[PDB]
């Protein structure tokens, strides 16, 4: 019997945080996401499930603020918290200073709650991972978040069920689309094969896909419905 | 390993005398990647045993150095985050001291407070202690300085440090140099010197590419503030090292 | 390989399954419920409910399964009738009282996540709130109702959180047997009187008894009329249409 | 051979007692003797010390305590619940009765004050009752003088000349034996020592012992002197050479 | 069966247990001090082990000189010495600016033990795992010993040890003092007390030592205070 | 045999051929040989003989190879009991096999004992399940008694080898027998080259000596250390076919073999 | 698993087992006694130690006062009984200085059973095991006579007792009383019951003592007489022990 | 199991056990029976004949007015009842006081049941033993109701129901005799249709039962104990053979 996994004030006989641990099992029985970039211009990908074949999907992406955005995978209800947080920073630091808050600051605290979780006894851990995107006076970026905390800094990643069928996209074609700039237009086509080969049978409907994009003279902004057939 | 029925909490000695929980957190680091920081006769060095995940990973944009205000670095290894959860307690302390007592902060002084800052969360039962092992040192009007820290709270007053995977590494590593500079050394002597460390460390992981950074404060070349590097400056302090060995 | 007898006992507390198991039981305790029904023309939305005869002397509309929540919404309890009302209570001093901060009408999709903003409230507040409840409160509403933004619509909200659209819902004690045929009784063309004759057919495969006006109960929304519900005596002229219409 | 209910203090079992206060009293025994009588005229107080290393300055501590220039106590247990008691329980005479009532406490006011310091750790789990039992001595002009004990569990009794601890089955024995109802006070202390007498190890001298008594005014201790009526105390405790000598009869 | 894991359980037999495995986790250092008094001073030594080779050993050090005329030396382990040390050098605020005048110590380890007699009836904290010892040189009743603990017995020794040799020194210190039947000790220089105390404990548990493997407190009357590797020498040059 | 050596009285191994002790070594030269040797004094005394002895300490100490060796000399029959090996879950049976050899001692001519861990017996009884502690003491007591009944012999010696002394207070079991206690030492730095002499010999090695061994020897002060040493730098003369032994080898055996004898 | 470690547990059995293992506490405790009849109420009562350097001469134990009107008798517990009178003492005279009359007794014993219903549920607390009797008098009922159960459910019963043994004493009670005894009635009835169901042969004075409530008061309110010794070995003499 | 020793969690089978157990509890307490006429309506109970030395001066009682036109009923224990019955009537007071305007009966059984709730949701708290039910008249108005009300905190509206010993016995008479097709008009039906109720439990002993009625314009009337004695025989008076 695995013990000392009911709760994460204990940790392992050897170092190790269980409850943390077994959170990360949560983002691999949600749907997929994945994420991009360009010197000028990034972009994610996010396939998502249905109910039945009757129901609506399910909101996936979500506007924090315009000059960055997010992109979830695992636990949802634990997201809309992480979404209210940045949506207070990003309305805090332009009521105050007025300066562009620097995306590479987001995840440089939300670190600092993750944390602060995982201490004392009560509550869970956020049990969910999802990625960041946006542009500011320095560049574009993307940041990643997986529940113990770690973030990172990338140029491409993806995460949830069946993921890495789509990584090694990347880690084949990663030269190529990041020196790409001033045309989206392909770019934005360059996940739809990375994430194809990562199906079961899916078939990519154009409900199931969402889509979202930010750059230095375009706003993030979400293209779902009938104006991504195109992008097939 | 021994005792079993006493490690599901802190505050439980065993009847030895000993709390386990703390016993398991330290065989954390040794989980955990390789840091250093060695002292100089004018300031002091860091250095760090980066890893990688892929070449996805955006080169020299995830630092993992973590800066005080007051010409004071820090360096932590084991769980990231409890280390940057106590460093960000430090620009929080800081600010408690320099606002009141018109100053600058002691280094000294400083420690005590991280270093019983850590003791609180070894002495309940509704926290964990900080699964880290974190490095500081800087500049003050009597000098420079180095400690070491430690989730049992008994951090200390070192010349050189380790921790991590590559503690026996540089066990010695460091140690021959108090040896062969009883004279001290300069900044620019040291780090054609700390970046061989790190590449000797990492022999235990010959497959798990990597990356390094360092950074180094001292009154001489720097002015009594804390600084990264840059440049044509660790392109061939590296050198100092890619070529001393191979 | 031991097994989930352990991690169970807890709302905090995953499994290495991944996942949490009492927010997984509550959806089990609607289950014991009566049924629930809602499907929507582009006409109107129609609800359907069994009300679970316990014995010959209750004043049937003593309880209710239904609701004049505001102008334009109505909902359907399913589940734990009792903490329902810790809902609606918070759910209707929300229409209200958007009717003075902004002084209009409401959309429901601000309502539907209200209330689901709510049931979350045991653990994480999404507006860093504190912690009220150490028990998710089993019940699965049905917000129908109307905004001009997009019309007629409903929808599903779990004590789990998260919502769906669904265009013809079905929960209870015949989540599946009903909502399984109902994939094949829906058409985006229906008139009203096409949406209450199946409501009442659908709810007659599903349960014990014979119908009756006692023993069942259903309204329907309009615009302009509103959250109109129908009296015994109309819905019983319903029953006899259908059996002279089944011939 | 106990088990599932001196675990804690708040399940009363089905033979309906509570759990451990009954076991925080077998300290009290496991403690030194102590003893006390009630006279004619006065009350007495009494403990020996098995101080361990024999290097301590054994004068320092003090099983005796103060309360009042009129009121004197001692435990017969544990140590540390002691000499925070004491505080705990003078801060009581002040603000509770003195500073309302202008003068000092009697003796039962001033215990009861001292049982509502226990109470309060036995409402509620993991928080341990104290591990002592004490006993006060004390006099005043409505009813006069009085010996009680105090238990952990709250209680407090009356009494007329006991002893507690170790020797306590033993020496109540002979008190019972060595008594009168109505003797004088220096014979008391030609008791007490040869009640003490009973389970002692080691010395006997007034050096390894601490015994106090109360008695008639003492003004020489007041120092204030210029007042008819600013009596002085009632209190005070016999020196070691004031004792050594009356140990040679 | 409980009874051990919790600080406020006592057993059937009267005797709780989890302080008396802190009264035992103090010699985790393998270090053992003593103190002895003077005619108007006294002193503390303590052994010093800084095996490996990158320590500082100027602040390595189990000594804290909290204010004027006091002094502590400690066992268990360090960190949580620290953790007294500190609330010492906030009382002697507070006694001067609320009371008037400076702490003795006999008050300052009579509150500092209630303390640590607190976290002995409720689970706020643990219990330190110190046993440590204050000195000072009194304005009224002189100089003083007094030896804390973890659960509040304190006690003035007229000279004592600790650590893992206490049995010993226990042997020879009342040895020495019945050999001319006094507590303290003659020959006033706090210096030449040093020369006393050194060479009565390398023949009690018999090794020779250097200067850089001692430290030492010294409690002269206006200051107390520490010295480095002066006079090393005495001891064997007669 | 069934169950131990029993060493036929004569297997001579050398009680000095060791880097142990002279004093311990002599203080237990009264208890056992000077009656068997001379039984002219305690008659004449009429003091019955002793009544067996603790040797405290953890191990390298050699606390089990004096034991055997010093019965070789005076020559009687050296078996074991570890009480971790003796304990059944069942409620008797552990007290039978405590019968079964004070029966089987006296079965021989003479005997004598070497329990070992015999802390098993003397428990804290800090968990108290009357159930089980309620026979902690039943089969303890049964050693009591079974130990000195009406056995007036001089031959039936007693030790109990006891890591952790002090560990048991549900009983000392102090007054009486128990008439020694030796106060054991580790091995000090003296004594390395003392040890380190012993199993050095029958060796061609061009000598391998020096004084960087105790310093080497320094904390890793357990006679396990030096066998080992000597083991494994006789397997580094051997790492490339060489002919006799260098001392480096030593200093590099203790200096990087204590590793694992001072961590864990 | 069995339904006791805390009093917030219903059974499956429907019952909370916690309660029950408090109304069994008072069985330990000492023996108490009341009648009401014409002339005034009376009460009795047993020490439970009638050891010999001890006096209980002059200290009550198990009749304390709250009023001029009302007194009580007490077992249980001690340290769990003097904060309830404590508070008694309280609301009384919290009901006086705003309402300028005296205490109903109803309104107190309905205010002292309802705080250890408090004690019973909301929060992981001790339940005070207490078994009070309450005598007294008020105008709107003439003579009264209530009893409590640390539940928190009362009755206002005409003559009966708790502690030690009542099932046999009230067989004692129930046959052999007649209400219109005036006073001696009830006093060589109560003295004869205790000296039936005791522990041991002495019934000295020490080990009881009585009280009594008598509206002698000629159109004033109301008198007690708590006897010392002096007055009650001179009557169990005077009754035929 | 052991999913049954709380109250902040689920089975299963998706139900929370310490709540149902309470209906264990309630099962084990007295019969309170409530009809309604056509113009009046009626409320009973099975009250105990204990013994002999409770005053004949204050019987027992159930029932429980709040005010002039409601009235309460209950069964279960009676100390966790006592509660909710003065934060009733506290609360029907402020009614009046804040609107000018009594209560509706409505507003009054979800205050009850608005406790009931709070009462089994946060922990720490035990609930209340007691199913209980609401009887009375609107003002301004003849329409009667009365509404019951259970521990896990819902309000329904039965125009006859029964609460624990042999009710199950009851709510089944009652449904082979009482019906909507005849409603009763007046007293002396809906009491020889309630009387002949109670019979199942009452084993034929007139010292254990105690009824009461409801007026319109806020008034009540209760009852005596010949004032049944002779109901005990018209509903024998039937019973001749
Ligand atoms: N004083 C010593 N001199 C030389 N070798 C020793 C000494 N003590 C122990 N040893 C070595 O250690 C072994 C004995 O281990 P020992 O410490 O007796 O185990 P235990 O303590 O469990 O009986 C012997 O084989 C011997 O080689």
Avoid at chain 2, 144 to 173: C, D, F, I, N, V
Avoid at chain 7, 58 to 66: F, I, M, P, Q
Wanted: net charge negative; proline share 4%.
């Amino acid at each position: 019997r695995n013990n000392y996994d009911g709760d994460t004030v204990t940790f392992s006989p050897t170092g190790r945080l269980f409850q943390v641990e077994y959170a990360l099992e949560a983002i691999k029985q949600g749907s997929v996401t994945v994420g991009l970039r360009s010197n000028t211009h990034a972009v994610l990908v996010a396939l998502k499930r249905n109910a039945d074949e009757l129901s609506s999907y399910q909101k996936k992406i979500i506007k924090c603020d315009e000059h960055m955005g997010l992109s979830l995978a695992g636990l949802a209800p634990d997201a809309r918290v992480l979404s209210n947080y940045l949506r207070q920073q990003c309305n805090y630091s332009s009521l105050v200073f007025n300066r562009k808050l620097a995306v590479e600051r987001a995840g440089h605290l939300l670190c600092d709650k993750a944390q602060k979780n995982t201490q004392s006894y009560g509550g869970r851990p956020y049990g969910v991972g999802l990625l960041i995107i946006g542009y500011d006076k320095s560049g574009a970026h993307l940041l990643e978040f997986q529940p113990s905390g770690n973030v990172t800094e990338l140029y491409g990643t993806a995460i949830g069920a069946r993921s890495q069928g789509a990584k090694t996209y990347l880690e084949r074609t990663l030269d190529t689309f990041i020196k790409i700039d001033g045309n989206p237009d392909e770019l934005i086509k360059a996940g739809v094969e990375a994430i194809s080969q990562s199906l079961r049978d899916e078939s990519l409907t154009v409900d199931n896909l969402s889509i979202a994009i930010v750059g230095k003279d375009t706003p993030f902004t979400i293209y779902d419905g009938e104006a991504v057939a195109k992008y097939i | 390993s021994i005792g079993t029925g006493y490690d599901l909490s802190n505050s439980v000695f065993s009847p030895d005398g000993r709390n386990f929980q703390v016993e398991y957190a330290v065989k954390a680091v040794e989980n955990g990647t390789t840091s250093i920081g060695i002292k100089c006769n004018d300031g002091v060095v860091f250095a760090v045993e980066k890893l990688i995940t892929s070449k996805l990973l955006v080169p020299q944009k995830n630092v993992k150095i973590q800066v005080v205000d007051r010409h004071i670095g820090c360096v932590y290894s084991g769980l990231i985050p409890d280390g940057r959860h106590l460093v960000n307690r430090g620009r929080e302390e800081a600010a408690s001291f320099k606002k009141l007592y018109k100053t600058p902060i002691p280094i000294p002084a400083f420690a005590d407070r991280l270093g019983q800052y850590v003791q609180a969360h070894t002495l309940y039962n509704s926290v964990r202690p900080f699964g880290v092992s974190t490095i500081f040192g800087g500049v003050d009007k009597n000098g420079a300085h180095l400690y070491m820290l430690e989730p049992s709270g008994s951090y200390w007053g070192y010349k050189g440090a380790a921790t991590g995977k590559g503690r026996q590494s540089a066990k010695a590593e460091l140690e021959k140099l108090v040896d062969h500079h009883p004279e001290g050394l300069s900044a620019r002597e040291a780090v054609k010197q700390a970046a061989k460390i790190i590449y000797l460390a990492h022999e235990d992981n010959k497959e798990k590419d990597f990356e390094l950074e360092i950074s180094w404060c001292s009154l001489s070349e720097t002015n009594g503030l804390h600084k990264f590097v840059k440049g044509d400056l660790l392109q061939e302090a590296i050198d100092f090292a890619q070529k001393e060995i191979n | 390989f031991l097994t989930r007898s352990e991690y169970d006992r807890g709302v905090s507390t995953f499994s290495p399954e991944g996942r949490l198991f009492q927010v997984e039981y509550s959806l089990e305790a609607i289950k014991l419920g009566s049924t629930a029904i809602g499907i929507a023309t582009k006409e109107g939305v129609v609800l359907g409910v069994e009300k679970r005869a316990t014995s010959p002397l209750l004043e049937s509309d003593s309880i209710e399964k239904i609701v004049e929540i505001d102008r334009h919404i109505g909902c359907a309890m399913s589940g734990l009738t009792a903490d329902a009302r810790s809902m609606i209570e918070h759910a209707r001093t929300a229409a209200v009282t958007h009717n003075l901060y902004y002084d209009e009408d409401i959309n429901v999709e601000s309502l539907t996540q209200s209330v689901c903003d709510l049931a979350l409230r045991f653990g994480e507040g999404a507006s860093g709130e504190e912690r009220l409840m150490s028990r998710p409160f089993g019940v699965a509403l049905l917000i129908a109702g109307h905004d001009a933004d997009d019309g007629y619509q409903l929808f599903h909200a779990e004590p789990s959180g998260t919502f769906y659209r669904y265009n013809a819902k079905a929960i209870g004690s015949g989540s599946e047997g009903a909502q399984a045929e109902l994939l094949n009784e829906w058409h985006s063309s229906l008139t009203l009187k096409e949406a209450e004759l199946l409501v009442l057919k659908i709810l007659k495969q599903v349960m014990e008894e014979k119908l009756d006006e006692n023993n069942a109960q259903l309204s329907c929304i309009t615009k302009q009329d509103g959250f109109k519900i129908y009296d015994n005596e109309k819905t019983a002229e319903l029953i006899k249409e259908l059996k002279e219409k089944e011939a | 051979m106990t088990d599932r209910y001196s675990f804690s203090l708040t399940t009363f079992s089905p033979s309906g007692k509570l759990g451990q206060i009954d076991y925080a009293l077998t300290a009290v025994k496991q403690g030194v003797t102590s003893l006390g009588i009630k006279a004619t005229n006065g009350v007495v107080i009494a403990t020996e010390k098995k101080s361990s290393s024999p290097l301590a300055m054994s004068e320092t501590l003090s099983k005796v305590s103060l309360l009042t220039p009129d009121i004197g106590a001692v435990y017969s247990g544990m140590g540390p619940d002691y000499r925070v008691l004491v505080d705990k329980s003078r801060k009581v005479a002040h603000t509770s009765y003195k500073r309302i009532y202008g003068e000092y406490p009697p003796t039962k006011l001033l215990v009861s004050e001292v049982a509502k310091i226990m109470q309060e750790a036995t409402q509620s789990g993991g928080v341990r009752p104290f591990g002592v039992s004490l006993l006060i001595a004390g006099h005043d002009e409505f009813n006069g003088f009085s010996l009680y004990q105090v238990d952990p569990s709250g209680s407090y009794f009356p009494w007329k000349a006991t002893a507690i601890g170790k020797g306590s089955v033993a020496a109540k024995t002979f008190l019972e034996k060595r008594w009168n109802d109505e003797l004088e006070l220096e014979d008391a202390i030609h008791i007490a020592l040869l009640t003490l007498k009973e389970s002692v190890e080691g010395e006997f001298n007034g050096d390894t012992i601490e015994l106090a008594i109360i008695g008639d005014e003492n003004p020489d201790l007041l120092g204030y002197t210029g007042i008819p009526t600013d009596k002085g105390p009632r209190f005070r405790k016999l020196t070691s050479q004031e004792i050594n000598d009356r140990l040679e009869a | 069966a409980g009874y051990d894991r919790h600080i406020t359980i006592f057993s059937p037999e009267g005797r709780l247990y989890q302080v008396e495995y802190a009264f035992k986790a103090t010699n985790q250092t393998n270090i053992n001090s003593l103190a002895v008094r003077g005619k108007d001073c006294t002193v503390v030594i303590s052994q010093k082990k800084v095996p490996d080779k990158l320590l500082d050993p100027t602040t390595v050090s189990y000594i804290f000189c909290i204010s004027r005329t006091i002094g502590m030396v400690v066992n268990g382990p360090i960190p949580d010495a620290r953790n007294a040390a500190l609330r010492a050098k906030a009382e002697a605020a507070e006694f001067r600016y609320k009371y008037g005048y400076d702490m003795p110590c006999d008050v300052l380890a009579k509150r500092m033990a209630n303390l640590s007699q607190i976290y002995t009836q409720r689970a706020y904290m643990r219990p330190l795992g110190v046993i440590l010892t204050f000195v000072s040189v009194d304005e009224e009743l002189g100089p003083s010993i007094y030896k804390t603990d973890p659960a509040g017995y304190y006690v003035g020794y007229k000279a004592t040890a600790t650590g893992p040799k206490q049995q010993e020194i226990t042997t020879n210190l009342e040895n020495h003092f019945k050999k001319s039947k006094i507590d303290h000790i003659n020959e006033e220089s706090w210096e030449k007390v040093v020369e006393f105390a050194i060479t009565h404990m390398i023949d009690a548990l018999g090794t020779e030592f250097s200067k850089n493997d001692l430290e030492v407190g010294v409690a002269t009357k206006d200051k107390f205070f520490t010295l480095s590797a002066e006079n090393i020498e005495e001891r064997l040059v007669a | 045999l069934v169950y131990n050596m029993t060493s036929f009285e004569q297997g001579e191994i050398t009680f000095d051929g060791i880097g142990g002790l002279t004093e311990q070594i002599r203080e237990l030269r009264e208890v056992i040989e000077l009656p068997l040797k001379n039984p002219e004094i305690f008659q004449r005394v009429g003091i019955k003989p002793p009544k067996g002895v603790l040797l405290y300490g953890p191990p390298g100490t050699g606390k089990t190879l004096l034991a055997k060796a010093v019965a070789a000399t005076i020559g009687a029959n050296f078996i074991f009991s570890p009480a971790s090996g003796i304990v059944d879950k069942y409620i008797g049976e552990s007290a039978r096999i405590i019968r079964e050899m004070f029966a089987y001692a006296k079965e021989h001519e003479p005997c004598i004992i070497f329990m070992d861990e015999v802390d098993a017996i003397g428990g804290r009884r800090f968990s108290e399940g009357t159930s089980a502690d309620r026979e902690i003491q039943r089969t303890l007591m049964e050693l009591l008694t079974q130990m000195d009944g009406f056995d007036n012999l001089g031959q039936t010696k007693i030790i109990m080898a006891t890591n952790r002394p002090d560990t048991l207070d549900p009983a000392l079991l102090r007054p009486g027998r128990l008439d020694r206690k030796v106060e054991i030492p580790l091995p000090n730095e003296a004594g390395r080259l003392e040890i380190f002499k012993i199993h050095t010999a029958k060796v061609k090695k061009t000598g391998e000596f020096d004084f960087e061994a105790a310093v080497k020897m320094s904390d890793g002060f357990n006679g396990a250390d030096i066998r080992n040493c000597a083991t494994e730098a006789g397997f580094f003369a051997i790492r490339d076919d060489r002919d006799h032994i260098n001392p480096d080898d030593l200093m590099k055996a203790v200096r990087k073999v204590a590793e694992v004898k001072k961590l864990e | 698993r069995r339904y006791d470690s805390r009093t917030t547990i219903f059974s499956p059995e429907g019952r909370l087992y916690q309660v029950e293992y408090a109304l069994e506490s008072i069985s330990h405790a000492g023996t108490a006694i009341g009648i009401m009849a014409s002339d005034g109420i009376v009460l009795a009562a047993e020490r439970k130690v009638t050891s010999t350097l001890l006096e209980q001469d002059t200290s009550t134990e198990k009749l304390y006062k709250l009023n001029d009107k009302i007194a009580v008798a007490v077992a249980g517990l001690t340290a769990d009984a003097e904060i309830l009178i404590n508070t008694a003492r309280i609301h009384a005279q919290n009901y006086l200085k705003t309402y300028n009359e005296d205490i109903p007794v109803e309104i107190l014993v309905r205010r002292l059973s309802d705080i250890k219903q408090g004690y019973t549920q909301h929060g992981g607390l001790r339940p005070f095991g207490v078994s009070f009797i309450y005598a007294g008098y008020d105008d709107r009922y003439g003579y009264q006579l209530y009893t409590s159960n640390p539940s928190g459910n009362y009755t206002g019963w005409k003559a009966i007792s708790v502690g030690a043994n009542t099932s046999a004493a009230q067989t004692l009670l129930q046959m052999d009383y007649k209400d219109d005894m005036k006073v001696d009635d009830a006093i060589e009835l109560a003295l004869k019951t205790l000296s039936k169901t005791t522990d041991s042969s002495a019934l000295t004075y020490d080990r009881l003592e009585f009280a009594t409530i008598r509206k002698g008061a000629n159109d004033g309110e109301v008198y007690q007489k708590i006897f010392k010794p002096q007055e009650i070995k001179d009557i169990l003499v005077k009754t035929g022990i | 199991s052991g999913y049954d020793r709380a109250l902040s969690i689920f089975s299963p089978d998706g139900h929370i056990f310490q709540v149902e157990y309470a209906l264990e509890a309630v099962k084990r307490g007295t019969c309170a029976v409530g009809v309604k006429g056509k113009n009046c309506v009626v409320l009973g109970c099975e009250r105990r004949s204990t013994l002999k030395l409770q005053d004949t001066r204050i019987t027992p009682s159930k029932v429980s007015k709040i005010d002039s036109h409601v009235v309460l009923s209950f069964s279960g224990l009676n100390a966790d009842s006592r509660i909710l019955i003065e934060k009733a009537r506290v609360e029907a007071q402020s009614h009046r006081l804040t609107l000018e305007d009594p209560v509706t009966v409505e507003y009054l059984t979800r205050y009850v049941a608005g406790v009931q709730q709070r009462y089994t949701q946060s922990g720490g708290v035990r609930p209340f033993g007691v199913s209980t039910l609401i009887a009375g008249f609107d003002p301004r108005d003849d329409e009667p109701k009365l509404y019951q009300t259970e521990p896990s905190g819902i309000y329904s509206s039965w125009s006859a129901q029964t609460i624990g010993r042999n009710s199950k016995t009851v709510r089944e008479f009652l449904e082979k005799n009482y019906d909507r097709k005849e409603p009763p008009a007046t007293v002396e039906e809906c009491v020889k249709l309630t009387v002949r109720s109670l019979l199942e439990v009452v084993q034929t002993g007139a010292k254990n039962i105690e009824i009461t009625v409801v007026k319109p314009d806020s008034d009540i009337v209760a009852l005596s104990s010949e004032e049944i004695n002779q109901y005990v025989t018209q509903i024998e008076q039937e019973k001749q053979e």
